Amino acid sequence: QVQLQESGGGSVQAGGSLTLSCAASGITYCMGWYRQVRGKEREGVAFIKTNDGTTDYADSVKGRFTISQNHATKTVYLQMNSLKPEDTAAYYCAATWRWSCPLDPEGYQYWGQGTQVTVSSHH
Amino acid sequence: GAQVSSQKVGAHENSNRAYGGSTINYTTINYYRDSASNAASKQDFSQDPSKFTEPIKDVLIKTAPMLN
Amino acid sequence: GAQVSSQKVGAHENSNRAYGGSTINYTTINYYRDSASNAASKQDFSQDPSKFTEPIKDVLIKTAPMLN
Amino acid sequence: ACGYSDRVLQLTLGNSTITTQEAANSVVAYGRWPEYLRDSEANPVDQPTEPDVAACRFYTLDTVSWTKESRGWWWKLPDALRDMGLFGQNMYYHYLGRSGYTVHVQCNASKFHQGALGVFAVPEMCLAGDSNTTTMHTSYQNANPGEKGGTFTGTFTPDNNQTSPARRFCPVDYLLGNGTLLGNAFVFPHQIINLRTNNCATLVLPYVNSLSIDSMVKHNNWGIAILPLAPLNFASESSPEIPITLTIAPMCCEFNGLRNITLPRLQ
Amino acid sequence: ACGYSDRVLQLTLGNSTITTQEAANSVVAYGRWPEYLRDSEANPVDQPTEPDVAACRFYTLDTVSWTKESRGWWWKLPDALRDMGLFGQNMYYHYLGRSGYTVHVQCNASKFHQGALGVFAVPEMCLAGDSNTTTMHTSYQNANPGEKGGTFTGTFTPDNNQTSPARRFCPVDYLLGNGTLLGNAFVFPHQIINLRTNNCATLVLPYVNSLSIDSMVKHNNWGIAILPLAPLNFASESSPEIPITLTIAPMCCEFNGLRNITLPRLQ
Amino acid sequence: AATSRDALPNTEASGPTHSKEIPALTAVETGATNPLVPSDTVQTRHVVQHRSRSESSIESFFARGACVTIMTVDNPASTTNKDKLFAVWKITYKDTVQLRRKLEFFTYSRFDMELTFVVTANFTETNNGHALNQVYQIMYVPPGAPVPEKWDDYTWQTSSNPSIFYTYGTAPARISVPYVGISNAYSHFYDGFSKVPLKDQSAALGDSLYGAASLNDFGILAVRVVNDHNPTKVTSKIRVYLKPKHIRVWCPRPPRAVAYYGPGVDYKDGTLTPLSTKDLTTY
Amino acid sequence: AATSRDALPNTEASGPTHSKEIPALTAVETGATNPLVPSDTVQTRHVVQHRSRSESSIESFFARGACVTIMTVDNPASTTNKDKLFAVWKITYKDTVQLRRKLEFFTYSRFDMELTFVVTANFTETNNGHALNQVYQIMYVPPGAPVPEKWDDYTWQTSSNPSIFYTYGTAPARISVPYVGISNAYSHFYDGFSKVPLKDQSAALGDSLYGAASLNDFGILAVRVVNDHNPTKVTSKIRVYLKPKHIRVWCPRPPRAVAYYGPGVDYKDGTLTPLSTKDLTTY
Ligand SMILES: CCCCCCCCCCCCCCCC(=O)O
Ligand SMILES: CCCCCCCCCCCCCCCC(=O)O
| Segments making up each domain of chain C, as ranges | 1-68
* CATH number, domain B1-68: 4.10.80.10
User: How far away is chain F from the Cα of G189, in angstroms, using its nearest Cα?
Assistant: 26
Rounded Cα gap, residues G271 and B1, in angstroms: 64
Of G3, G57, G112, the CB nearest to B10: G112
Strands E27-28 and E203-205 come out as parallel
CB-based contact E8 B65, cutoff 8 Å: yes
Strand, coil or helix: G101: helix
Residue D216, phi then psi, degrees to nearest 5: -80, -45
- In order, the DSSP letters of chain F are --BTTPBP-PBPP---EEES--TT---GGGSPPP---TTTTS----B----B-GGGSHHHHT-S-EEEEEEEE----TT-SS----EEEE--STTSSHHHHHHTTEEEEEEEEEEEEEEEEEE-SSS----PPPEEEEEEE-TTS---SSTTSGGGG-SSS-EEEEETTSS-EEEEE----SSSS--S---B-SS--BSSS-TTTT---TT--STT---EEEEEE-S---SS-EEEEEEEEEEEEEEEEEEE---B-SPP-SSSS---TT---------TT--
Which of A111, F176, B67, A17 is CA-nearest to residue D26? B67
Strands G220-225 and G87-90 come out as antiparallel
F216 CB near ligand 1 (under 6 Å): yes
Question: G113 CA distance to ligand 2 centroid (A)?
Answer: 7
Residues 6+ apart with CB under 8 A from A88: A117, A118, A119, A120
Which of F169, F170, F200, F179 is CA-nearest to residue F113? F179
Rounded Cα gap, residues F156 and F152, in angstroms: 7
Residue G251 DSSP class: E
**Cα A27 from chain centroid (whole Å):** 19
**Cα G124 from chain centroid (whole Å):** 32
Q: How many CB pairs under 8 A join A and G?
A: 66
Say if CB E225 and CB E122 are below 8 A apart: yes
* Other Cβ atoms closer than 10 A to E152: 24
Q: How was this structure determined?
A: cryo-EM
F145 CB near ligand 1 (under 6 Å): no
Of how many residues is chain F composed?
Answer: 283
Which of E72, E88, E71 is CA-nearest to residue E80? E88
CA distances from F123 to D247, F74, F120, F166, F234 (A): 68, 9, 11, 19, 4
Instruction: Collect contacts of G93-101 with beta carbons under 8 A, ≥24 apart.
Output: G93/G66, G93/G68, G93/G242, G94/G263, G95/G68, G95/G69, G96/G66, G96/G67, G96/G68, G96/G69, G97/G260, G98/G66, G98/G67, G99/G66, G99/G67, G99/G68, G99/G242, G100/G256, G100/G260, G101/G255, G101/G256
- In this structure, which amino acid lies at residue G70? I
Q: Which residue of G has its CA nearest to B18?
A: G3
Which of F133, F143, F179, F161 is CA-nearest to residue F223? F161
Rounded Cα gap, residues E108 and D226, in angstroms: 34
Ligand number nearest to the C-alpha of D124: 1
Say if CB F256 and CB F98 are below 8 A apart: no
For domain F1-283, the CATH architecture is: Sandwich (2.60)
Say whether residue G24 is in contact with chain C using an 8 A CB cutoff. no
Domains of chain D: 1-267 (2.60.120.20)
Q: Which residue of B has its CA nearest to C4?
A: B18
Residue E21, classified by CB atoms within 10 Å of its CB into exposed (0-12), middle (13-18) or buried (19+), is middle
Rounded Cα gap, residues B54 and B50, in angstroms: 5
Which of C66, D193, E58 is CA-nearest to residue G21? C66
User: How far away is chain C from the Cα of G260, in angstroms, using its nearest Cα?
Assistant: 28
Hey, CA dihedral for F253, F257, F260, F264, is it positive or negative?
negative
Nearest CA to ligand 1 atom 2: F140
Which of E176, E187, E177, E195 is CA-nearest to residue E233? E195
G106 CB near ligand 2 (under 6 Å): no
Question: B44 CA distance to ligand 1 centroid (A)?
Answer: 24
F188 CB near ligand 1 (under 6 Å): yes
Rounded Cα gap, residues E118 and E224, in angstroms: 10
Breaks (C-N over 2.5 A) in chain D follow: none
Of how many residues is chain E composed?
Answer: 267
Buried (b) or exposed (e) across E36-73, using 16+ Cβ within 10 A? bbeeeeeeeeeebbebbbbbbbbbbbeebebeeebebb
Residue of F89, F117, F216 best suited for mutating to test ligand 1, as the one with most atoms within 8 Å of CB: F216
Rounded Cα gap, residues G174 and G168, in angstroms: 14
Buried (b) or exposed (e) across F50-69, using 16+ Cβ within 10 A? eebebeebbbbebbbbbbbb
Rounded Cα gap, residues E249 and B6, in angstroms: 52
Rounded Cα gap, residues D50 and D99, in angstroms: 10
Strands D27-28 and D203-205 come out as parallel
**H-helix or E-strand containing E91?**
helix E85-92
- In this structure, which amino acid lies at residue F22? I
Residue G264, phi then psi, degrees to nearest 5: -90, 180
Which of B48, B12, B6 is CA-nearest to residue F8? B48
Residue G44, phi then psi, degrees to nearest 5: -115, 150
Rounded Cα gap, residues G40 and D124, in angstroms: 87
Nearest CA to ligand 1 atom 7: F218
CB-based contact G176 C46, cutoff 8 Å: no
**H-helix or E-strand containing E65?**
strand E64-66
Strand, coil or helix: C60: coil
CA distances from F255 to F101, F104, G38 (A): 7, 6, 73
Rounded Cα gap, residues E171 and F135, in angstroms: 103
Q: In E, which residues are within 8 Å of B63 by CB distance?
A: 2
- Domains of chain G, residue spans: 1-283
Compute, in degrees rounded to 10, the torsion defined by CA atoms E129, E131, E134, E138. -30
Counting atoms of ligand 2 from 1, which one is nearest the CA of G221?
2
Strand order in the sheet with D73-76: D150-151, D73-76, D222-234, D113-123, D190-194
Strand, coil or helix: E190: strand
Say whether residue D162 is in contact with chain B using an 8 A CB cutoff. no
CA distances from F199 to D265, D266, D267, F225 (A): 5, 8, 10, 51
Say if CB F226 and CB D111 are below 8 A apart: no
The chain C residues in contact with chain G (CB within 8 A) are: 8, 34-38, 40-47, 52-56, 60, 62-67
Strands D150-151 and D73-76 come out as antiparallel
CB-based contact F18 E17, cutoff 8 Å: no
Rounded Cα gap, residues D13 and G129, in angstroms: 82
Ligand number nearest to the C-alpha of F174: 1
CB-based contact G3 C34, cutoff 8 Å: no
CB-based contact B57 D25, cutoff 8 Å: yes
> What's the helix, strand, coil split of chain G in %, to 5?
5, 25, 65
